[PDB]
Amino acid sequence: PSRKAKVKATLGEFDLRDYRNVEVLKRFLSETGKILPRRRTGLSAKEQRILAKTIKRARILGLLPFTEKLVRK
Amino acid sequence: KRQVASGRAYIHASYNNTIVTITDPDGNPITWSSGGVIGYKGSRKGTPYAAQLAALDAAKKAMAYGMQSVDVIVRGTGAGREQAIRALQASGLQVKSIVDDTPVPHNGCRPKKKFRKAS
Amino acid sequence: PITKEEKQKVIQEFARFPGDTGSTEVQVALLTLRINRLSEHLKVHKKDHHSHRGLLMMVGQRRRLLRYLQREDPERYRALIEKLGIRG
Amino acid sequence: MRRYEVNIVLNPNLDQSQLALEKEIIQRALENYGARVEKVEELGLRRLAYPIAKDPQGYFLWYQVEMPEDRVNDLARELRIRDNVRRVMVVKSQEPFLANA
RNA sequence: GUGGGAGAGGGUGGUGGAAUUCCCGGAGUAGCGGUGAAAUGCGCAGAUACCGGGAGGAACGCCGAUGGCGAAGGCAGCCACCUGGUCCACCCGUGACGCUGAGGCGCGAAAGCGUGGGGAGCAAACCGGAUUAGAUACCCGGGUAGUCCACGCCCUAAACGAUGCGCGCUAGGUCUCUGGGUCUCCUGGGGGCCGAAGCUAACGCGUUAAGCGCGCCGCCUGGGGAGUACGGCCGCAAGGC
Ligand SMILES: [K+]
Ligand SMILES: [K+]
Ligand SMILES: [K+]
Ligand SMILES: [K+]
Ligand SMILES: [K+]
Ligand SMILES: [K+]
Ligand SMILES: [K+]
Ligand SMILES: [Mg+2]
Ligand SMILES: [Mg+2]
Ligand SMILES: [Mg+2]
Ligand SMILES: [Mg+2]
Ligand SMILES: [Mg+2]
Ligand SMILES: [Mg+2]
Ligand SMILES: [Mg+2]
Ligand SMILES: [Mg+2]
Ligand SMILES: [Mg+2]
Ligand SMILES: [Mg+2]
Ligand SMILES: [Mg+2]
Ligand SMILES: [Mg+2]
Ligand SMILES: [Mg+2]
Ligand SMILES: [Mg+2]
Ligand SMILES: [Mg+2]
Ligand SMILES: [Mg+2]
Ligand SMILES: [Mg+2]
Ligand SMILES: [Mg+2]
Ligand SMILES: [Mg+2]
Ligand SMILES: [Mg+2]
Ligand SMILES: [Mg+2]
Ligand SMILES: [Mg+2]
Ligand SMILES: [Mg+2]
Ligand SMILES: [Mg+2]
Ligand SMILES: [Mg+2]
Ligand SMILES: [Mg+2]
Ligand SMILES: [Mg+2]
Ligand SMILES: [Mg+2]
Ligand SMILES: [Mg+2]
Ligand SMILES: [Mg+2]
Ligand SMILES: [Mg+2]
Ligand SMILES: [Mg+2]
Ligand SMILES: [Mg+2]
Ligand SMILES: [Mg+2]
């Protein structure tokens, strides 16, 4: 499960610490606004730990969703 | 007497019962149904079949208002959720979309003892 | 916090000779800096215990160093205390 | 002195007079609290992921500054005085941490 | 000492969204809820289901781990400030300044105590409904203390790795968190698993010893009587030692 393809593998060279950048960070969330696990994000321990902080920041700023409605169930 | 013809269908499903509320696009209720609305009384309200009957009832009462197509919003996880969706699809109402809105907190309130080992 | 300039200010003050960062004088002076600042931090934040342990440890260290000094060269010890304004 | 980043989210409904008034107040606050402005990026109106004060949009200002630490929080408090200011977030600035490089 | 690193370590202030309850309005009607099945309960003074607006308390989903930090208790939304410990590199300074530690002092989950505040959800006690031969319980509906904040007490625990602290010595393999380097690898600091020698009553332990050694502290001496009696110390009490 969660094996489909590698969120990190397809993406450019980006700053993991940038909360203002949205369009890149969007790819680290599921259909719901939940933060994808390492299985998906493909990141490393430190990378993931930083991503979490960043995403949460952008959430508070209102640039990223806390929660999203699941469609076609 | 309304003549809405475009609407939303809220399916609220628990293990004890199923309630279907059909409303206008602004969310204001038109008609509603449930396991208890139909003949069922006891635990049989939680039954998938009872859910079907409820959905169908709500759909008929809706088409009485000239309703045609709805957007389904599903809240709750329990038996007869998917059956209610099914009945709605087969009800003659065109189902445009189905969405799961089921409420979850982020460790908000202490659940009662039955629901514990969680928060 | 303790800025680099303050720390050099105190180190070059107590140094036995040019370039001495390690003498008992320098160590005890530095410890006294940290202890004082930590106590100042603990006058408010009375409920911060985990730092207070730190304070106990620092005081213990300073006391052992000073005991060593007074055992070795009582003159430099008297001088150190007269300087820093230790004891009480 | 330390380097921070000030995120300001304002009300998108404002016209030029009110917006520029908010800007003036913001920069007067920044100067009065002793912050020196290094770089500023104004993104402006952008669609929020969730409604803030019932508005689907918001106006975005960003100020990279250098200011005394002891006053930082106070500055933020001041920035939050006005009604037209929806959000204020001051972040200690950090060096970029990349991936796929 | 200098230059860097990781972290739910601690304290103060600020702030975010989800959910629950309650209040107000709209729309809407005959039930909702709950169980093994039910009933009590709530609902025509309009509930449940749905939309909008408001009030409040409490806890932080995903990330989240087999992970990290702390001396222990324990620590998890985000932001800033104050602050403890620790790791690495350089090989610069001091020159045995070390270890352990009876008493002492401090910290110490939960429950509990005192004064005041707060109180959404949960909920000892209690009140009801069921179940049973009986049900003083288990299941359901209510519900006070309490749970929350401040200040001051209380000192306990399966406070557990049921494994005192420090140093040296004795094959490796593998996974992992975090440093540094001549980066496939090498070299540090942690966390796991399998295992040399060896040890163990066995189970198992095995460079994170329960192996080989040295230093210092605490403790044990068949079961019940009994953590009782007596005395003392501490505590407002409960009670603790
Ligand atoms: K530090
Ligand atoms: K009492
Ligand atoms: K014990
Ligand atoms: K490296
Ligand atoms: K066993
Ligand atoms: K006694
Ligand atoms: K007494
Ligand atoms: Mg919502
Ligand atoms: Mg039922
Ligand atoms: Mg620093
Ligand atoms: Mg890298
Ligand atoms: Mg922390
Ligand atoms: Mg807080
Ligand atoms: Mg809310
Ligand atoms: Mg109402
Ligand atoms: Mg009537
Ligand atoms: Mg209230
Ligand atoms: Mg630190
Ligand atoms: Mg040397
Ligand atoms: Mg010499
Ligand atoms: Mg000791
Ligand atoms: Mg206690
Ligand atoms: Mg307590
Ligand atoms: Mg009390
Ligand atoms: Mg009280
Ligand atoms: Mg009162
Ligand atoms: Mg209750
Ligand atoms: Mg009960
Ligand atoms: Mg009582
Ligand atoms: Mg005992
Ligand atoms: Mg244990
Ligand atoms: Mg290791
Ligand atoms: Mg063997
Ligand atoms: Mg083994
Ligand atoms: Mg004993
Ligand atoms: Mg004895
Ligand atoms: Mg005996
Ligand atoms: Mg005997
Ligand atoms: Mg005994
Ligand atoms: Mg005993
Ligand atoms: Mg005992």
Q: Which residue of D has its CA nearest to A11?
A: D100
> How long a stretch of residues is chain C?
88
- Indicate which CATH number applies to the domain containing A66: 4.10.640.10
Count CA within 13 A, CB hemisphere, residue B3: 0
- Residues D64 and D39: their CA atoms lie apart, in Å, by 5
Nearest-CA neighbor of B84 among B53, B41, B42? B53
Find the largest Cα–Cα distance for chain D: 45
Burial of B106 (C-beta count, 10 Å sphere; 0-12/13-18/19+) = exposed
Tokens encoding B94: 């065109």
- Provide the number of structural domains found in chain A: 1
- Residues D93 and D71: their CA atoms lie apart, in Å, by 16
Of the partner residues D9, D43, D98, the one whose CB lies closest to the CB of residue A16 = D98
SS3 content of chain D, % helix, strand, coil (to 5): 30, 50, 25
Tokens encoding C6: 């303050």
Amino acid sitting at position B72:
V
Nearest-CA neighbor of D29 among D19, D37, D41? D37
Q: Cβ A65–D91 below 8 Å, yes or no?
A: no
Tokens encoding B85: 């969706």
Interface check for B74 against chain A (CB to CB < 8 A): the answer is yes
* CA-to-C1' span, D35 to E221 (A): 74
* CA-to-C1' span, B113 to E125 (A): 18
Which nucleotide in the DNA or RNA is closest to residue B54, CA to C1'?
Answer: E49
Tokens encoding B33: 């149904």
What is the DSSP code (8-state) at residue B114? Answer: G
Q: Where in the sequence is the domain holding A30, given as residue range(s)?
A: 1-73
Method: X-ray
CATH number assigned to the domain covering C1-88: 1.10.287.10
Chains contacting C with at least 3 CB pairs below 8 Å? Answer: none
Superfamily of domain B1-119: Ribosomal protein S11/S14 (3.30.420.80)
Annotated domain spans of chain B:
1-119
**Which residues, other chains included, contact C84 with Cβ-Cβ below 8 Å and sequence gap of 6+?**
C28, C29, C32
With residue A47 as reference, give the H or E element that holds it: helix A45-61
Question: Facing residues of B98 across strands?
Answer: B72
Q: Which domains does chain D have, with CATH numbers?
A: 1-101 (3.30.70.60)
PDB resolution in Å: 3.3
Annotated domain spans of chain C:
1-88
3-state SS, residue B34: strand
